[PDB]
């Protein structure tokens, strides 16, 4: 049983020398069966990656202690290459990180255009006030 509709959380990404930049924000919301959430990134408004219902503790989990969960549908954002059409059952991975002094969730997305992905960041003591 899950208490929460919808949240906002700031989202990161690894800029092109390896930075971590602010990117946007991240509209987490909470369906029948699943989750959606979507990137609000400059002005282009667009779905992120979602997950059915079986995925959700597993969502829950990984996004307060690292760990793993099963996507229906990722896209990600523009640079990378599932944004046109997204890719099912794609799994992300989350690992713990300090950044600033701010520990935050991270987790690779995919192939962008020497294989390179896309790298991001959640702050993790947001994701755990609002993720139950």
């Known amino acids: 049983k899950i208490e929460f509709s919808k949240f906002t959380v700031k989202i990161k990404n690894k800029d092109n020398n390896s930075n971590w930049t602010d990117l946007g924000d991240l509209v987490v ?19 992120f990656f979602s997950l059915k219902e079986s995925e959700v503790n597993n969502f829950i989990k990984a996004m307060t202690k690292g760990g793993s969960f099963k996507t229906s549908l990722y896209y990600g954002y523009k640079y990378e290459q599932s ?13 713990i990180e300090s950044i600033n ?12 255009n020497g294989d390179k992905t896309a790298e991001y960041a959640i702050p993790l003591e947001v994701l755990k006030k609002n993720l139950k």
Request: charged share 25%; glycine share 16%.
């Open 101 to 112: 002094g701010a520990e935050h969730i991270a987790f690779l997305g995919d192939k962008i």
């Open 29 to 47: 919301r909470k369906e029948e069966n699943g989750i959606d959430t979507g990137l609000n990134a400059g002005g282009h408004s667009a779905t």
């Open 83 to 95: 944004s046109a059409n997204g890719i099912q059952n794609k799994e992300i991975i989350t690992k």
